[PDB]
mmCIF file of C-alpha atoms in Angstrom:
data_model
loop_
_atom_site.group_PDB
_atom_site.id
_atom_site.type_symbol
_atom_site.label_atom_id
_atom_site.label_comp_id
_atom_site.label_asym_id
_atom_site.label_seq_id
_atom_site.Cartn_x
_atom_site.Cartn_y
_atom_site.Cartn_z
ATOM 1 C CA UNK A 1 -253.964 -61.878 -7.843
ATOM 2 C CA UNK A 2 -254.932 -61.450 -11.587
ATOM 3 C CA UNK A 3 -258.300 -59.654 -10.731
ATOM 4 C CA UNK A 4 -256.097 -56.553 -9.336
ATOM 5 C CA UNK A 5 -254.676 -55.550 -12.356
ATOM 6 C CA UNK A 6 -258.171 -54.122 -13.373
ATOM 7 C CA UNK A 7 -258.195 -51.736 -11.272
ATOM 8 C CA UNK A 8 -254.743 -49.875 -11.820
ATOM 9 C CA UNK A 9 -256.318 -46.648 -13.163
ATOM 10 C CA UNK A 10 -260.097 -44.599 -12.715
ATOM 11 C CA UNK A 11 -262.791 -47.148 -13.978
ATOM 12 C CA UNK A 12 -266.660 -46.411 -15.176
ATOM 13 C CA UNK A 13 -269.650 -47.396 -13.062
ATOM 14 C CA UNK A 14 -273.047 -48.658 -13.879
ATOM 15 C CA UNK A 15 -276.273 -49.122 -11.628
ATOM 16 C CA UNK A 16 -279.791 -50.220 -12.030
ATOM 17 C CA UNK A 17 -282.289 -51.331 -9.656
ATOM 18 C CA UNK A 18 -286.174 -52.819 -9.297
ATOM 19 C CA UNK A 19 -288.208 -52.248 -5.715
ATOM 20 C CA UNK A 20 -291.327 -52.657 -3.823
ATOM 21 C CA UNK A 21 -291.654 -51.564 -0.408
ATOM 22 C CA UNK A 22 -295.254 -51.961 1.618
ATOM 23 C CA UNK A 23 -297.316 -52.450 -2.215
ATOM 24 C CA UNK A 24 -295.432 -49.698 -3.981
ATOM 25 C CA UNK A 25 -293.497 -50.618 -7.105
ATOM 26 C CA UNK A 26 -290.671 -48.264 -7.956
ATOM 27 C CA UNK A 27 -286.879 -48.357 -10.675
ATOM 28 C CA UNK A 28 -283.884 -45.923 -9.709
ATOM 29 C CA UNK A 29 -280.684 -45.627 -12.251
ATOM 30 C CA UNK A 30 -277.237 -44.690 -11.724
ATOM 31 C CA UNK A 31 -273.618 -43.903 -12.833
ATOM 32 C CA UNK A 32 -270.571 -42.644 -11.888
ATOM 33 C CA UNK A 33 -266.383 -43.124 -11.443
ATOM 34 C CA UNK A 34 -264.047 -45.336 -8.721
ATOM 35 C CA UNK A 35 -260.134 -44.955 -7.932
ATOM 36 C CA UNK A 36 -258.826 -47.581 -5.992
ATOM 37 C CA UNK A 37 -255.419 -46.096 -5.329
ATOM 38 C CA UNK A 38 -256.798 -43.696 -3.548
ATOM 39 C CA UNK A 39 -260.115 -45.386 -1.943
ATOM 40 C CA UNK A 40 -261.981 -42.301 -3.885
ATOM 41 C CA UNK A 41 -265.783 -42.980 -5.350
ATOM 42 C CA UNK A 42 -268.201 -40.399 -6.531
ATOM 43 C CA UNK A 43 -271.895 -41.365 -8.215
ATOM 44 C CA UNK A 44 -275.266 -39.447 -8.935
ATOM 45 C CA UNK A 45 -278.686 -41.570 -8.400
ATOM 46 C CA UNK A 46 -282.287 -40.404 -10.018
ATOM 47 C CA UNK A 47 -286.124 -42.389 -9.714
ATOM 48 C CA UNK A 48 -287.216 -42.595 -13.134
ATOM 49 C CA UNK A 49 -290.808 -43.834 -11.944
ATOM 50 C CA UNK A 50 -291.408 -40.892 -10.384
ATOM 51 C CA UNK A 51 -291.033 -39.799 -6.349
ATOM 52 C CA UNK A 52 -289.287 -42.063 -4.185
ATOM 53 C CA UNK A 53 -292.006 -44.022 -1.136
ATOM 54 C CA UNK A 54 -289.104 -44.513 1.401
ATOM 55 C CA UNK A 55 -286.396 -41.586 2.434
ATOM 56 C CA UNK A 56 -282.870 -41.392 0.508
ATOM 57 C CA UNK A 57 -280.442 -42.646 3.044
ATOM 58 C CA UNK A 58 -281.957 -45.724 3.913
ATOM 59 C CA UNK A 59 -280.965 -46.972 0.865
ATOM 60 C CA UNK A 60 -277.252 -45.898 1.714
ATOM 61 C CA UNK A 61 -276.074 -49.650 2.650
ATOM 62 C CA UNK A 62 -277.227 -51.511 -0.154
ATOM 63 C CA UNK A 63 -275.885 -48.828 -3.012
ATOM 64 C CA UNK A 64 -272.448 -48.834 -0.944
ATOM 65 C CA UNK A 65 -272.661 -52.635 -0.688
ATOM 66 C CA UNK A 66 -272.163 -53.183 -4.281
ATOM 67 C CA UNK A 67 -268.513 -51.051 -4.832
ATOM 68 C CA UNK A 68 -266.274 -52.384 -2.214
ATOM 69 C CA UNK A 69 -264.116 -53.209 -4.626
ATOM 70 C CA UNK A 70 -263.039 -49.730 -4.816
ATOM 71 C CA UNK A 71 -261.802 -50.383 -1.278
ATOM 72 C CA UNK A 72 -258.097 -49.247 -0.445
ATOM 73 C CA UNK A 73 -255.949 -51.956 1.190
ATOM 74 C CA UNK A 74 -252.622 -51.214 2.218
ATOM 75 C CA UNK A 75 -249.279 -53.505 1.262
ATOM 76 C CA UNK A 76 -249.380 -55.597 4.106
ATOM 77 C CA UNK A 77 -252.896 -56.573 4.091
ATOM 78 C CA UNK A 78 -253.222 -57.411 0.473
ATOM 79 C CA UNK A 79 -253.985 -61.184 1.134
ATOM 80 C CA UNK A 80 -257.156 -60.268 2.474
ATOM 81 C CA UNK A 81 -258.488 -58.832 -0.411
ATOM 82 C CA UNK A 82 -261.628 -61.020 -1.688
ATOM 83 C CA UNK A 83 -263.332 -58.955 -3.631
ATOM 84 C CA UNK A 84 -260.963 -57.702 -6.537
ATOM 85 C CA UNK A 85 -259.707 -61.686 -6.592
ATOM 86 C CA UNK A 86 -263.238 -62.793 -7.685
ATOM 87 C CA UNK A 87 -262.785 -60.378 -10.989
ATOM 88 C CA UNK A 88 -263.853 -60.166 -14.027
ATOM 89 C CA UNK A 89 -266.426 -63.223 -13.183
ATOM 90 C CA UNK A 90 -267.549 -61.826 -10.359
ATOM 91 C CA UNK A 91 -270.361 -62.623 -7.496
ATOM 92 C CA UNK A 92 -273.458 -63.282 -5.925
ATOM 93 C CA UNK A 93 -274.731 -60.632 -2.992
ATOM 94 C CA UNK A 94 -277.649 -61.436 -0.258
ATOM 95 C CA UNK A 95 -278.522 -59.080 2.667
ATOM 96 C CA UNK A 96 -281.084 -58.383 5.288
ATOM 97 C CA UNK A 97 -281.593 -54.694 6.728
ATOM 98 C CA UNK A 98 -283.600 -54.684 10.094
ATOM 99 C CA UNK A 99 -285.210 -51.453 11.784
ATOM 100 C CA UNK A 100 -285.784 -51.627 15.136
ATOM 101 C CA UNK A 101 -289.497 -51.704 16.191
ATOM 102 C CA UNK A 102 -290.637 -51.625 12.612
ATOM 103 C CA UNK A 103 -290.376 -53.688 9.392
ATOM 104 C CA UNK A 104 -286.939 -55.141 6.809
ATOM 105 C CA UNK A 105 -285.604 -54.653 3.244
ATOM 106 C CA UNK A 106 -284.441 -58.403 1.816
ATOM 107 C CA UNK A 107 -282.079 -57.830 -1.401
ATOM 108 C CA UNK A 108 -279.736 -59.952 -3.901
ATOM 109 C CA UNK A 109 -277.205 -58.921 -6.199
ATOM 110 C CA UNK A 110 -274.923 -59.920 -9.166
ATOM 111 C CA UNK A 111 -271.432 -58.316 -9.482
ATOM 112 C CA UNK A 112 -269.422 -58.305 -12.294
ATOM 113 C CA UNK A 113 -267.836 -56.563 -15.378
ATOM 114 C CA UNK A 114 -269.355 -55.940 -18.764
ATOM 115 C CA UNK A 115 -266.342 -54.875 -21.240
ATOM 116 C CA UNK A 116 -264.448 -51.952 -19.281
ATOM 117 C CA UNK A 117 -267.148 -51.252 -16.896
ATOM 118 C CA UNK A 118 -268.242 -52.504 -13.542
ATOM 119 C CA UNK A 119 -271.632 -53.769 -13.479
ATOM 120 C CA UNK A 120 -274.576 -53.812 -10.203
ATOM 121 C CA UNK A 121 -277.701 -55.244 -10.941
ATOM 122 C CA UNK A 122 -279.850 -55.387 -7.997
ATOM 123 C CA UNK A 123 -284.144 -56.213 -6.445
ATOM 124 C CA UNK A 124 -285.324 -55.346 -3.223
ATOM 125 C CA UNK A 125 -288.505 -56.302 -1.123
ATOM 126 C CA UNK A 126 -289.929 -54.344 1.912
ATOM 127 C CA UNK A 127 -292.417 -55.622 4.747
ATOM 128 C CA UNK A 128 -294.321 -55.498 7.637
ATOM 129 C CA UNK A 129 -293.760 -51.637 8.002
ATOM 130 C CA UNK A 130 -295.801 -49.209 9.930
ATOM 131 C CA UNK A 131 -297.959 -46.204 8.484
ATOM 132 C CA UNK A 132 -297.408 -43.629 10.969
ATOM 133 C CA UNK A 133 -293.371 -44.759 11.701
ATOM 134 C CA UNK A 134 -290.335 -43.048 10.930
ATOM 135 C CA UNK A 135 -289.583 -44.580 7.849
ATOM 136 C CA UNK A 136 -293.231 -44.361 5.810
ATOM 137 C CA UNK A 137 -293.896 -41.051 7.916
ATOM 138 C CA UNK A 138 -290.248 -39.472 6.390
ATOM 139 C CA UNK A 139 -289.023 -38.192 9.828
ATOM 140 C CA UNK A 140 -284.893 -38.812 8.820
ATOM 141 C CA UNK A 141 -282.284 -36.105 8.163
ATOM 142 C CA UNK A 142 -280.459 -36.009 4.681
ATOM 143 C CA UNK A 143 -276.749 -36.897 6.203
ATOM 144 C CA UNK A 144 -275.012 -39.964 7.260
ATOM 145 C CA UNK A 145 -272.460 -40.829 9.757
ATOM 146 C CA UNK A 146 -268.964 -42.037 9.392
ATOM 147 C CA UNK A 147 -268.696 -46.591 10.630
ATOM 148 C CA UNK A 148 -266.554 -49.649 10.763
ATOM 149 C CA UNK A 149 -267.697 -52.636 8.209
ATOM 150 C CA UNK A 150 -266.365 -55.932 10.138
ATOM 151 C CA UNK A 151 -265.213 -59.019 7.997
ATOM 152 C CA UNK A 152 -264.886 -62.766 8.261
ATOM 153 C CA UNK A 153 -264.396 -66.098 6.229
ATOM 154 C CA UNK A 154 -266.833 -68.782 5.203
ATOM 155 C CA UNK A 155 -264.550 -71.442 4.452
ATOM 156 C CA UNK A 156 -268.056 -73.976 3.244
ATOM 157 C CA UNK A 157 -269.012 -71.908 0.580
ATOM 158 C CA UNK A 158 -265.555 -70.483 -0.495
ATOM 159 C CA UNK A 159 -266.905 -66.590 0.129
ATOM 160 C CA UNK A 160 -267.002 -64.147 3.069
ATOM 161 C CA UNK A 161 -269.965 -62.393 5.796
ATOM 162 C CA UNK A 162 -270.052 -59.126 6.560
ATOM 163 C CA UNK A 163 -271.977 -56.890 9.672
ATOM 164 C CA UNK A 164 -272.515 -53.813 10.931
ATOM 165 C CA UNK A 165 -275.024 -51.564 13.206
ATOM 166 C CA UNK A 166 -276.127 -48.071 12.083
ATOM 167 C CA UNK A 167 -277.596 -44.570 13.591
ATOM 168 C CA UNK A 168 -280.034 -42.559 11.693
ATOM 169 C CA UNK A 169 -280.642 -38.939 12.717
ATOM 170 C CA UNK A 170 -284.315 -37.962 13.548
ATOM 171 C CA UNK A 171 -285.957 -34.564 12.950
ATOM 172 C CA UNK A 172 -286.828 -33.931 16.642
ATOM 173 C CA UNK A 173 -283.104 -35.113 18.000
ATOM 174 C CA UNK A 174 -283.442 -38.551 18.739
ATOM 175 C CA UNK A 175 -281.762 -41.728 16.538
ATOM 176 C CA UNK A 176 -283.697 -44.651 14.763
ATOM 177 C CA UNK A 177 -281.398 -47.959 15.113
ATOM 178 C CA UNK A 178 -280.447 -50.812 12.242
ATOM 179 C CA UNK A 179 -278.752 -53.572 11.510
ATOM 180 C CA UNK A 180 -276.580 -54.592 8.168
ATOM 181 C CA UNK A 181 -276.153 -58.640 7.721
ATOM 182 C CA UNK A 182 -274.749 -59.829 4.338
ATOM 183 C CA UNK A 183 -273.299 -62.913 2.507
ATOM 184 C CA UNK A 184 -271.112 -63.336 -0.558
ATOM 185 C CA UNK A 185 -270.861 -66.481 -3.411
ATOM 186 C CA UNK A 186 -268.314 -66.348 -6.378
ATOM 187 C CA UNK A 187 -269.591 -67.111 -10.003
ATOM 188 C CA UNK A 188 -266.998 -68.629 -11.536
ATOM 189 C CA UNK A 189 -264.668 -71.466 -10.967
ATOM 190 C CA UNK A 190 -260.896 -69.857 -10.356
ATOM 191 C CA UNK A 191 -259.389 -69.763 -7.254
ATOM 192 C CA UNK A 192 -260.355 -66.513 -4.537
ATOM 193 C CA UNK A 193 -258.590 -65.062 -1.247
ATOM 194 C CA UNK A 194 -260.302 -66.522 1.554
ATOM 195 C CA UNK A 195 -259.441 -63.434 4.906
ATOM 196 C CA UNK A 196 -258.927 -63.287 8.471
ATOM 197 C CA UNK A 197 -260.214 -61.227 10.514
ATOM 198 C CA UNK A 198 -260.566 -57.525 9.773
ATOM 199 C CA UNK A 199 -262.658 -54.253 8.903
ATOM 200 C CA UNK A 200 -263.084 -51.483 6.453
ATOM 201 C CA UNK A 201 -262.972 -47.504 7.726
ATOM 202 C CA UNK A 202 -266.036 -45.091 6.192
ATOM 203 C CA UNK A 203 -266.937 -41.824 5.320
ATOM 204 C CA UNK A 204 -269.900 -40.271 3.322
ATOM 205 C CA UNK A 205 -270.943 -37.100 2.465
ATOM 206 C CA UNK A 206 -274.744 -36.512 1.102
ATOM 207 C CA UNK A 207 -275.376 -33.347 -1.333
ATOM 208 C CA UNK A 208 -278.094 -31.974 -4.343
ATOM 209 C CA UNK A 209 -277.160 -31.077 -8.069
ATOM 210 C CA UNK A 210 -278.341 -27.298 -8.135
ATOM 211 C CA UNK A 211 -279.760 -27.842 -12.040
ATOM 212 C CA UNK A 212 -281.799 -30.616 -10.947
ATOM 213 C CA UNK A 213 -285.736 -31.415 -10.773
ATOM 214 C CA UNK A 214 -286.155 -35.001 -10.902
ATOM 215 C CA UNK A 215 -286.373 -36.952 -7.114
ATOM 216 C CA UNK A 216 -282.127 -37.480 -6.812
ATOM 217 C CA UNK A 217 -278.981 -37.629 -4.751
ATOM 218 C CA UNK A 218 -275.278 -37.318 -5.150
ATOM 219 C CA UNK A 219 -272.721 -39.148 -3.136
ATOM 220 C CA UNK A 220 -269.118 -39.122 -2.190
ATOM 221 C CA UNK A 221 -266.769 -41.889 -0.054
ATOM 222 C CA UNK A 222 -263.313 -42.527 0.954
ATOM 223 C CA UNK A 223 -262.606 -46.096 2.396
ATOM 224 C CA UNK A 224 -259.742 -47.699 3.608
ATOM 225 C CA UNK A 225 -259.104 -51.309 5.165
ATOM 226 C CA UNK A 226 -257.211 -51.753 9.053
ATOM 227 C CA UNK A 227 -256.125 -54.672 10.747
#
């Protein structure tokens, strides 16, 4: 395809994003570098409203969501790429994160470059969530576990669906459960890859800058795609 040509060598990254979870408004900013020959991303994220209402890695999935174009897909599966064939246009992300026995996080997306740098602009909006609960309580660990992302085709819209179910790690031993459901639209009108059935391999590792006193977090992935 003509979109894969862009990512040949280590590109720039830019993020920016509005929220408001339960009645409190809050803006986070970030940057950082992707290699796509080697399925290598690293990117530093800081509140610049203030403290953060909600913990750090339940906002894991939608940051992640956004750079799976940096995704490493071997020579026999490159027909399955959609992402990198929807480039430089770009498109449209929607997503719905469920908790089990509490409240959701609704989001939407636009992906796309700007000159030589990829672009993620995204909003988010949180409800019906409980006071005394894990989530507004901040009972969660700082770590994440490694997961499969699983991928199919939706042929009458031209773009793909994605899902996933996830394990967070509580303070006393036990987990907290979720669920990842997303939905993709291109922007422009050039032809895309349209995929059959497959997934994408993960692993994250959550850290701290040392120097730093603003409300942040540093993260690192490798990801690779298997048939």
């Amino acid at each position: 395809s003509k979109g894969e040509e862009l990512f040949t060598g280590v590109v720039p990254i830019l993020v920016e994003l509005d929220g408001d979870v339960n009645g409190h408004k809050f803006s986070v900013s970030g940057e950082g570098e992707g290699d796509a020959t080697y399925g290598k991303l690293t990117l530093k994220f800081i509140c610049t409203t203030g403290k953060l209402p909600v913990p750090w890695p339940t906002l894991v999935t939608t940051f992640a969501s956004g750079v799976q174009c940096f995704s490493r897909y071997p020579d026999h599966m490159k027909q399955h790429d959609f992402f990198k064939s929807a480039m430089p246009e770009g498109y449209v992300q929607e997503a719905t994160i469920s908790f089990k026995d509490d409240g959701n996080y609704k989001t939407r997306a636009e992906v796309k470059f700007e000159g030589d740098t990829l672009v993620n602009r995204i909003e988010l909006k949180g409800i019906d969530f409980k006071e005394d609960g894990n989530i507004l309580g901040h009972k969660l660990e700082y770590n994440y576990n490694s997961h499969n992302v699983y991928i199919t085709a939706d042929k009458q819209k031209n773009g793909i669906k994605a899902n996933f179910k996830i394990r967070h790690n509580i303070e006393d031993g036990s987990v907290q459960l979720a669920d990842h459901y997303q939905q993709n639209t291109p922007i422009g009108d050039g032809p895309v890859l349209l995929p059959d059935n497959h997934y994408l391999s993960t692993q994250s590792a959550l850290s701290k800058d040392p120097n730093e006193k603003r409300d942040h977090m540093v993260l690192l992935e490798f990801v690779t795609a298997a048939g």
